[PDB]
UniProtKB/Swiss-Prot annotation:
Domain of life of the source: Eukaryota
Location of this fragment in the whole protein: 3 to 435 of 550
Localization annotation: Peroxisome
Transmembrane segments: none
GO cellular component: peroxisome
Name this polypeptide is given: Luciferin 4-monooxygenase
Length: 425
């Protein structure tokens, strides 16, 4: 009964060929050519980094990693609080088909070990404040040959920074603008290994490329407008943070970051950076339903607040911020990014929105498995090319989640309405 399978429409702009590395390289190269185009802004220290800086350093890291001997048989871990440097090794690795495993930077040694025992990285990039945990983990995982320091210019405590690592490995006369990223099979080559005990979620490059179609979609993403700035407190190592940010880079936006929440810094940043869009994890929505300080800031450039909710809290937050509603999205680590998203300007309080392009969604009767019609409640199941290739070295868990037909069973109860909006119950 195809009428009861909700399908995404055609993408505004058709799905681009190329790896995720190649598409990020191509977009970023263009922005790099316009001086002063801002990529990231650290709200705490107030430092800006431009696309030219970001592009050049990413390309230098890609080439240095290649000369060091990394290739598609290798993985790297990136372990760090949100920062200006976080995406440099992520981009450099995607440029060369090296899989990236973000490790949650508040994981202790035990959680870290389990994460990295699944990802098995050869090189670990880490912030200064994570160095000790990584040193303690390296002891039990000798596969880690090299630790590189992210937020340092010079060597740090006997370890190379990203800058001196690059200098150690670049050929003479290296040209960042002549560099060409690696081409490979984007379905077979893993881009990201995300954590979901925790398991490892393998995401081929293909899932990111589809995300980049959604990201710049005027209905399912953000329209590419100049001088667009986003404020993001979301962890970069979590799919919500990872896949929104990569998409913002494709778009040329200014990504203003915070690595720890504070009420004044956050509202003052919205005001002073004239933020157009803001990202909140769910507990920060409850937080701003309680806030009264919002009223004291000029938030007239704010177009949207995006949520990775209860209909009550979302309604209150929208009102406090003087917005028509909340831009909700629903996704799992296992689906790369959001597979249901509030279509631009067509929000419904309490809905998670509509099926994104390339995807499909249904709800099924709980004890049965039978597909259901409008306004009927059952388990949400989704099918599309952003679904993980699988949990790493764990086929039983993978087969328990995704059926022989490619349907991923979300575990959540939902229903969809006559306009094809989904509601999670
Ligand atoms: C509001 O728009 C968005 C855009 C991306 C997005 N990703 C989400 C997600 C991705 C991975 C894991 C968990 C998530 F909630 S929710 C969401 C919502």
């Amino acid at each position: 009964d195809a009428k009861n399978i909700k399908k995404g429409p055609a993408p505004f702009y058709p799905l681009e060929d190329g790896t995720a590395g190649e598409q990020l390289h191509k977009a970023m190269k263009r922005y790099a050519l316009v001086p002063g185009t801002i990529a990231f802004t650290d709200a705490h220290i107030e430092v800006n980094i431009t696309y030219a800086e970001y592009f050049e350093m990413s390309v230098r890291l890609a080439e240095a990693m290649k000369r060091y001997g990394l290739n598609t048989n290798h993985r790297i871990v990136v372990c760090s609080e949100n920062s200006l440097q976080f995406f440099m090794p992520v981009l450099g690795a995607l440029f060369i088909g090296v899989a990236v495993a973000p490790a949650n930077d508040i994981y202790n040694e035990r959680e870290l070990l389990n994460s990295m025992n699944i990802s098995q990285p050869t090189v670990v990039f880490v912030s200064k404040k994570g160095l000790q945990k990584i040193l303690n983990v390296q002891k039990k995982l000798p596969i880690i040959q090299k630790i590189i320091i992210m937020d340092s210019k010079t060597d740090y405590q006997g370890f190379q920074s990203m800058y001196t690592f690059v200098t150690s490995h670049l050929p003479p006369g290296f040209n960042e603008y002549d560099f060409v990223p690696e081409s490979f099979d984007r379905d077979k080559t893993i881009a990201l290994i995300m954590n979901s005990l925790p398991k490892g979620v393998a995401l081929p490059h293909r899932t990111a490329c589809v995300r980049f179609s959604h990201a710049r979609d005027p209905i399912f993403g953000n329209q590419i407008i100049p001088d667009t700035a986003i404020l993001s407190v979301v962890p970069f190592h979590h799919g919500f943070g990872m896949f929104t940010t990569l998409g913002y880079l494709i778009c040329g936006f200014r990504v203003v970051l915070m690595y720890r929440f504070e009420e004044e810094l956050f509202l003052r940043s919205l005001q002073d950076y004239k933020i157009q869009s803001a990202l909140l994890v769910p507990t920060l929505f409850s937080f701003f339903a309680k806030s009264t300080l919002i009223d004291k800031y000029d938030l007239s450039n704010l177009h949207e607040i995006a949520s990775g909710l209860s209909k009550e809290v979302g309604e209150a937050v929208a009102k406090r911020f003087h917005l028509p509603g909340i831009r909700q999205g629903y996704g799992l680590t296992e689906t790369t990014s959001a597979i249901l998203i509030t279509p631009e300007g067509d929000d419904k309080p309490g809905a998670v929105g509509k099926v994104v392009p390339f995807f499909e969604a249904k709800v099924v009767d709980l004890d049965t498995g039978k597909t259901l019609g409008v306004n009927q409640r059952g388990e949400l199941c989704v099918r599309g090319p952003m679904i993980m290739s699988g949990y790493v070295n764990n086929p039983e868990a993978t087969n328990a989640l995704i059926d022989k037909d490619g349907w991923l069973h979300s575990g959540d109860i939902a229903y969809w309405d006559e306009d094809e909006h989904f509601f999670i119950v």
